[PDB]
Amino acid sequence: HHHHHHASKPAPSAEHSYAEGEGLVKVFDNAPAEFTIFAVDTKGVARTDGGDPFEVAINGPDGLVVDAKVTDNNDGTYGVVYDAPVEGNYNVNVTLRGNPIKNMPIDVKCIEGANGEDSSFGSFTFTVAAKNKKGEVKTYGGDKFEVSITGPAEEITLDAIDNQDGTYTAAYSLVGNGRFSTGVKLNGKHIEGSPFKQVLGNELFSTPVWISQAQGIRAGP
């Protein structure tokens, strides 16, 4: 950050420096997560340069701990990157000189991106080929579900890790045993067979140009 000298700078206030992503912590099995540290000193005016002695520390379950990458932005702020090694909680702990800040410290569960968020976790399935829900083969058959909500899909929410792999969701229900005769064809021909128009009519309908005289009878007079 600073280069027109090196001899004197203020040490930030842990009373006033603090930290944000954009909202609150969210951390994944399949990616790191990031946040930023804003720096402020004795009267609440931001830091006028950088390279202050911050630290970030990322704890998991039992006895797991990893030191996180602070980096100075050249502006009075710092970028930080971190990860959650276990499908479980991680914990995020931030320090200035030897002192805490706010927003941090904080705990955060580790999940596969959006897989199993709201409301896509509640997505319809037969229990088929496995102890719960779908089987792990893409095409386990001819239909993803059989429906228990009423109305058309204009009014039914879809929410998925992908719109061709996931399916609709709903959390509303009455007391009963309702259904409609449908789902989402996974494979195979929707309504089976072929359409056709009726013929009415058959032969014959046409007759002789006259009915012939079979005899004359009358003999010699």
Curated annotation (Swiss-Prot):
It comes from the Eukaryota. Filamin repeats lie at residues 9-110, 126-200. The rod domain contains six 100-residue motifs that appear to have a cross-beta conformation. Homodimer. F-actin cross-linking protein. This is Gelation factor. The gene is abpC. The chain holds residues 646 to 839 of 857 of the full protein.
